[PDB]
Amino acid sequence: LGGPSVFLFPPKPKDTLMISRTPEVTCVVVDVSQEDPEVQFNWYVDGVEVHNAKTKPREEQFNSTYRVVSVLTVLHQDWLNGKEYKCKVSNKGLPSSIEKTISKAKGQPREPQVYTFPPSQEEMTKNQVSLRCLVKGFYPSDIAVEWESNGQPENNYKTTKPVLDSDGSFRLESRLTVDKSRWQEGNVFSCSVMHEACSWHLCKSLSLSL
Ligand SMILES: [Zn+2]
Ligand SMILES: [Zn+2]
Ligand SMILES: [Zn+2]
């Protein structure tokens, strides 16, 4: 007992769905001693070692330990195809090296439906109105939701964490809040929903206007 632990994190959902972008797997080593700061990383893709990993300069934590992070770029298709990413961590503080493995959630991809809603009758008596965008029937839970007004990014939104449904699929909600006037003056609002099961990972949704 004692000595370093390793934790392994998947890429960011949006990074996995936009081929334009660079998905990364991230290996984090904590409880590295002040004595043996140095950490070697070995990465594997379905068991075969890869060398493109970038290790970040180690960082001193307040509890008198070092934290060391290695970041492995992965290919759009490899990650989505369930390739297996292993992070092996060697330190003089460990008798023998430590492994973790991650891949995408196992299972049968399901395309979501997106339902868009103007504000409820009871909301239309308020200074501020909400525009709701409901996503249900997606598997896995990896997804990206975003809002534009007249193709410009809109930032006053909140998106629930996907919730598991009865049939195994996931459901979530996204709400964008704007001045009643902006809605009434007839501006257009778009929910942008990306999921792997959607064709080109671009889900179709109807824009909202009065
Ligand atoms: Zn080699
Ligand atoms: Zn793709
Ligand atoms: Zn389809």
Numbering used by the authors: 235 to 444
What does the paper behind this entry write?
Here we report a structure-guided approach to engineer monomeric Fc molecules to adapt multiple versions of half-life extension modifications. The pH-dependent Fc–FcRn interaction is a key contributor to the prolonged serum half-life of antibodies and their derivatives. Past efforts to engineer a monomeric Fc, defined as one set of CH2 and CH3 domains, have proved challenging due to the extensive interactions to be disrupted in the CH3–CH3 dimer interface. Monomeric Fc molecules would provide a quick and robust method for achieving structural insight at the Fc–FcRn interface.
To extend the compatibility of these dimer-disrupting mutations with half-life extension mutations other than YTE, we initiated our effort with a test variant, T1, by replacing the YTE mutations in the CH2 domain of the monomeric Fc sequence with a new set of half-life modification mutations in CH3 around residues 432–438. Despite the high degree of similarity of CH3 domains, T1 unexpectedly showed a formation of homodimers. The dimer interface, however, differed dramatically from that of wild-type IgG4. Visual inspection along with detailed interface analysis with PDBePISA showed that the hydrogen bonds involved in the IgG4 CH3 dimer interface were absent in the T1 dimer. Instead, a small set of hydrogen bonds involving amino acids Thr350/Leu440 and Gln355/Glu356 were formed between the chains, indicating a possible breach of the monomeric Fc formation. Upon inspection of the newly formed T1 dimer interface superimposed with MFc2, we observed that one of the mutations in MFc2, namely, Arg366, had shifted position in its side chain. This shift allowed for the Phe351 from each chain to “reach in” and form a hydrophobic stacking interaction. From a close examination of the structure, we reasoned that the Arg366 shift became possible partly due to the existence of space above the Ser354 side chain. Although analytical methods showed a relatively well-behaving T1 protein, the crystal structure suggests that despite the extensive disruption in dimer interface, there remained a possibility that at high protein concentrations the engineered Fc could be engaged in dimer formation. The crystal structure of the T1 protein suggested that the engineered Fc could be engaged in a newly packed dimer formation at high protein concentrations.
